[model samples]
Target: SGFRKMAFPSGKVEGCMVQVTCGTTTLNGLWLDDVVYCPRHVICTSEDMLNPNYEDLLIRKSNHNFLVQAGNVQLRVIGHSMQNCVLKLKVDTANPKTPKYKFVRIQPGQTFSVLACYNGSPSGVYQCAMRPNFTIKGSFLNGSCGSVGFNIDYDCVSFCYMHHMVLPTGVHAGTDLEGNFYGPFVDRQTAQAAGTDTTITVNVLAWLYAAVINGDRWFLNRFTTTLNDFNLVAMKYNYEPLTQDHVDILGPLSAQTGIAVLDMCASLKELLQNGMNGRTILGSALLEDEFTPFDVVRQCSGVTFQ
Candidate 1:
């Protein structure tokens, strides 16, 4: 056996193999297939493997999600509501006091935010009214971005987390980007104003774009094959992956795991960025309209597909 090279975050790294030939390392152990030897090795833990700011990247990217944190009770009203509307706030939902807004009128192309603080003991859930009469509910988070439009017959979902929590080990690549099911709205009151959509889109595209351009030569290797598997999973039940890049993209996002891959971190940059049709779908879910995200996305490629 001979010494094999490896990395330790101190600027050292190595190629990995499912069954690497057994060999002695430059300093400490020996490795062969699943068998590893390290007289001087120790175990430890942290948010990511290679990408130091992976957690922050995740946080920044989520600015593209539907549901942001209600941390500090802060919420925003994006100015993209087809019609002008007043935001209605209902705090302590279980036993709410008369709901109210700051007499602020939300107009198209305008934006408003409130830094509301916690009200009830323990934690509290709050609801907001969008445009004329749409309602949305959310709980407190350490750092929420704020809300989005609403839908009836819809049980708004938010699996994302706020700051101050251990970063998630991985993201549901497909589900994170564009959920297959009809849900996970960010509420109309807090969507990115159409103008801001550009900002959000730019940031997300750059983040993922660079990850690819960084040049691991990952695109042409094992990941290309992994993409095949992802597509196989995509063409099912009228469901698509949250991320379009598949292994090609998410693989780099999770590359921080370095040569020791555990799970993958994916970009959740795709939100329901509102438009005429987008609003209709949000409204139609409960209305049971035949119009569907599948129908819309497939028909208008650049309209929503990123």
Candidate 2:
């Protein structure tokens, strides 16, 4: 239970920091009004929002684990390595049987963004609801901050960097309010200088998959429902999340070949676990003309070809 509040360098306001560890999982974050600086990455707030409980926050640490309590809200974190950590969000009321959901573990190396903008319809005794996919619904009480709210956004890339995937050099990817992805352009000198016409469309999900198999890990960080799609692909091809041994094999295989292993191997889980046969199969596919590993299906062959 390490909760510390720090003042701004200019002595304007303050922000919050909490570092709580459970087993091998570490819940470390320094969050202010609109930004969340997790272990290694930073995330700015998005326009979307939800309600936050500002009730006297408290953390009770026991056996190196802890419980975070704020008014009627209670969250229990149990950490584990090599697998997902389990967290539970409970809304307590007079009714003995309270409503709760077992949250998906937010793995390491992920960035978390927390914001305060209302983006949902009010219902029940609360002002906002965090219901992704309509599968579950829970609310945190409205705080004294005059109907204040909060929103959390997540990225699949660890450390908020997309390094393992194949992307154009010097380009950063981003998603708009509609969830439409675009990128391959630098934002520094450019919001209006280039505009949408100059940006290239990006398939973020596919890129994420490629990164995962190529020795990259990710966290669900509040976007559990959207990221659930990964499980579908994992199931589609008898896939299991890669291990250190798998990464050891994929690391060199990817470096030595031009093939996009994420696309070339139908069952990455199987391919990664196989002995030398796996490597040999990928090598053969690389040499064969039947397989088209590159994303582009056709290429320009001068204006005459067109």
Candidate 3:
């Protein structure tokens, strides 16, 4: 038989020394030294504790600090017919205020990103609408940039303000009350024949050249020749004509005419450079200067005699 013992404060203790009776059993003989000793308890240090509660487990270590951070937000145009559409972002935070975001042009198939700073705490839903394609749509969570909030949804697939207003392709002629003609005329021939008189035609040609240089479409009818000899006479006397100082004051129209002759000489140089080969005879030493048929034609063709 296996023996069991119990220790006391004085010393080791043994089994029953005399007859013991309990409950329904009675012992008539003594066992004596058949006891085994068992220790009262076992003790462990604090470091050896095996389990911890949720609150205690969540406590940070003494040497460590916790941090929370966010990444940049981004928007992308994955698909579209015309890639140059403008994208406007609007964010509505729940404070009954209007949403605000920058207007950007999303290059076709390119992605654009923005940072979510602590400034607005921009928490709430965001909506994106593309111009010229009012149907395209997208969204973003308060701080999440990667999630595809919504597929492009729209009630109408038609274009917006951008595509609605486009000018026609060809030239448009116009005139003003002062006989100042303007707008686009097709070519030199068409420009020269645009209006009734040479002044109107010249005005039309000037405006046409301006339009072409500026890369814009204008109407030919938006010009006029009402103010007589506005640009032409000023250009001729002030810049184009050469004269002796103060000699052609008032009735010196003949001197001005002489200046015109000198202008024909200068124009002849341009005509020759442009490949004009024609012979002409001037009254005096006028041939000493360059002269060409084109020069005569440009200077005298439109001049009328009274």
Candidate 4:
């Protein structure tokens, strides 16, 4: 109902020109599958991984807005002049429920990532938005047929580019098959290249089952790297999933961070299994009647953090 033809400032984004499309061939104004030539306001897609039936994300079209694509994912947002940038991973299944929301601010030119969640008892749709706040010009020959790297500010406004990748694959504490299946990315610089990249892979099913069986000794995708070794983190450290009950161990910072991590993995799994309108209610009790964690600390054992 809120969908409308969004206009733009007019021209190419970051001074580049190419095309990217979502549907195999949706024949709408915003269309392209080869190179992504995002203008100022148009939204393009590589995969319609988003479900229109139950969820939607809004891009407040102010006089300021530009594309900042990284790793070929469209959840990133940013650069300047916006606040209270809202991100909601909605799940409107069953009767009345509240969707999960995450709010953050962006700096002038810093790169960061976000993963959002909503509902419990059944969590659904882990939509996200990121803000690198500057030109993300770099050549990409992997995800797209051949995507363009972002360059300095040029002013191709109006047409926008937005792309979504297929959901991360997961199973109930099964195998690292999914993690193994999607990893081993390497940096392309010869002298500046390190085998390891700051990558994290958490499995929802593994986290869910482990949280149940081992109490909360749960942590996944945890890794550390060196400058010279330049190798992938050990498989044990990267894909080794299962248990950690740190809500009490490390206080809100540790526990809440853990919960946030688990929830992120859970969010992806929910999106994979239930679509935008669905949720997986297994450990939904962890949530308050209202959203808490990674936002503020909740009272536990008659104690609270300031």
Candidate 5:
């Protein structure tokens, strides 16, 4: 007696094509390497024609390529349309030894292209590799491949840019430096370049002054005030909580003036709580007249002026 002849059904081979219609698209095809078993050993080899297992059979159609197995198999076609387009498939199992496949190109007016690959072999995963066509070469604004100098440092006064600060080295506004003002003082040219009108300048100066008198120091006067001493005093004077009105006024003012008024207020409040008189600590009773206390504090905080 012999084992009954159990002939397995011939595997169905599916095909798909991924072709570009208008712009250049990539076409990549891979063979499914999964094993499909039959009851007895049949033709098995590396050659696609000799492989009896449909899963091992790597078939290359016109623009499509996939494997055929003894059971159901799935094929996938994935790509994008540069313009509106359609792609068509031409398939034939004319010869059992060598199956043939073909793809018909479709143009923009066509309704749709196959969006997904579907079943022939359901067990395998498909992968896609594609890239955008006509990649933008460089920036639209300042087209420099090496380094686009769009930074504050490039626009710094030291960099010789058109819209830069006009101050000598080490003479910044709102700093402890001897020849500098507490708040930023732009000349007519600088003010124009910075897009500030005369009205804005006056308002900025007024707001800066208010921020200073209320204990908000814009500048850190590091050369004048000792930071260690300041911190010790600040820690000691934590009880005097700043009122909401103080923050409300200074918050918008700081935003408008482009100065750290809130932080300056906190510093000033600390100094007041520690009983360190602003006039004495700032080293000049007339400090408020020339520069806001904010400027003095900022200067004293060790920030290098201009």
Candidate 6:
């Protein structure tokens, strides 16, 4: 064979084939055709692939749930047998000689939710009374305006904490905005895989509004105070690849791994200055500048104060 090019016959060629000739020798080569052609496929690492809709998957944009801490206790009271009656709750401390808190009064309704704290060691005892002087028990109590009685149920919870002596890694013990302290939250998989211990590291940011929606006053108060006083500045984290931006003007608060601390009055003033949300009030600049009502609202939000 002499050096030459050949035009191979093709009518829906079964395979790709090429031939080369030089002097008196000829060589043949073949290329494997893709099994499926229209939708081309290739393998790659995570970094090499581009996801067009990655923003939707971001933690900031995603929905998260907040569960109560482990040791938080709740008492429920259902009223019966009494009209125009007042209900009260009392908690006993570890020492028989002392009371843990003042009498918590709940309005007379079909139901009442009185939140209480637990000091693990003593675990304390909860008692209830009705106006006109009647006590709550597996039995019933009688009151003034009418015969007063009570139905009650309670969930025993205590502060969440690491029980293990060798603290797990990646778990940090942080007090929530509300002043409630929780133990390191270690996931099952991480706790199990943990080399015994390690380390690891939100927003308006998202956690702020979340606390509001979840009726956590301490969380709102502490964080708001922090933001109001500028103890912390907000940082927006872009974590897909790791980047960050400082927030100047707050927008509709959303979610993200980024940490954000925002001032309640200042943020509201922004809305006021911009005349947004119909927020018109008659007062000195102090009205929007110094918001003390948030702390006042704390009293109405939960019973943690008592």
Backbone clash pairs for candidate 2 read 50-150
Cα RMSD to native, each candidate? 26.5, 22.3, 42.9, 19.1, 30.1, 34.2
Candidate 1, residues 1-306, lDDT tens digits: the string is 111111111100011001101121111111112222211101102222232332333233221121112222322212111111111121121212211111222221111111212211122222221111111122334222211111111122211111011112211100111112112322221232211111112122223233233332222223222433433432431223334433343343334334211121112111121112333222122112121222222222322210
Q: Pick the candidate with the highest lDDT.
A: 5
Error of 2 at 247 (Å): 6.4
lDDT of each: 0.20, 0.23, 0.20, 0.23, 0.24, 0.20
Residue 48 of model 6 has an lDDT of 28
After superposing candidate 4, which stretches have Cα over 4 Å from the reference?
1-125, 128-161, 164-234, 240-306
Task: Name the candidate, 2 or 3, with the larger TM-score value.
Answer: 2
State residue 121's C-alpha deviation in candidate 2, in Å. 6.4
When summed lDDT is taken over every stretch of 10 residues in candidate 2, the lowest stretch is 297-306
Question: lDDT tens string, model 6, 1-306?
Answer: 111111111211112122212122222211112111000001112232243222222222211111111124321212111111111111121212221222123221111121111111111122221111111111211100111111122221111111111223322221111212223322121232222211000122322333334443232222333442332221111111101221332222322212243444234324323433442222122221111122222322432321
**True-vs-predicted CA distance for residue 105, candidate 4, Å:** 11
Q: Residue 296 of model 6: what lDDT? A: 20
Q: Write the per-residue lDDT of candidate 2 for residues 14-70, one digit (tens) a residue.
A: 112223233333333222222222211111112111221111111322323433322
TM-score of each: 0.19, 0.16, 0.12, 0.20, 0.16, 0.16
| Overall local distance difference test of candidate 5 | 0.24
Model 3 lDDT, residue 258, Cα: 32
Error of 3 at 18 (Å): 99
Give the Cα-based TM-score of candidate 3 against the true structure.
Answer: 0.12
